[PDB]
Amino acid sequence: KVIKSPIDLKNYIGTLEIGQKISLSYERDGENKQASFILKGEKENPKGVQSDLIDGLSLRNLDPRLKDRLQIPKDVNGVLVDSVKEKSKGKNSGFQEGDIIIGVGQSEIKNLKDLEQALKQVNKKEFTKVWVYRNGFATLLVLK
């Protein structure tokens, strides 16, 4: 059975019974693999690993020991950028070292907890509207 859309695998599994191994095929960036997948339901999974917009990103919580802006936490709590690996959709799209993420997709974060909650939704997006505080100003970016 051939898959292009969510309802395709979904109903395709409505027609398959448990515990038989499917040797299904799947791609990533620009290469296909074939591997072997037991049918396991929702009641049936131990767990696991992901990334996308967090691939080779070193980031951490903050209240930074810099100047000057403004006295409210509201516009500084978020997450600091140590490093950005070039392949990541950030550096496709002008994300850089020394930035501070204040929000992801028009919505604001206080920390790695809020970052990772939004960063878990980014492969549900074709791009993201991030806001990153630089040395002086927050720029809006368009990450692809």
Residue 138 pairs in a beta bridge with 133
Which of 118, 137, 120 minimizes the C-alpha distance to 129?
118
Q: Which amino acid makes up residue 16?
A: L
Which of 58, 54, 75, 57 minimizes the C-alpha distance to 128?
54
Residues 77-136 that bind a copy of itself (CB under 8 A): none
Asked whether position 43 contacts a copy of itself by CB under 8 A, the answer is yes
Asked whether position 42 contacts a copy of itself by CB under 8 A, the answer is yes
Among 6, 14, 30, 41, binds a copy of itself (CB under 8 A): 41
Asked whether position 18 contacts a copy of itself by CB under 8 A, the answer is yes
Among 5, 15, 32, 71, binds a copy of itself (CB under 8 A): 71
Q: How far apart are CA 113 and CA 122, in angstroms?
A: 15
Asked whether position 49 contacts a copy of itself by CB under 8 A, the answer is no
Asked whether position 2 contacts a copy of itself by CB under 8 A, the answer is no
State yes or no: cis peptide before 82, omega within 30 of 0.
no
Contact set with a copy of itself (CB under 8 A): 18, 41-44, 46, 65, 67-68, 71
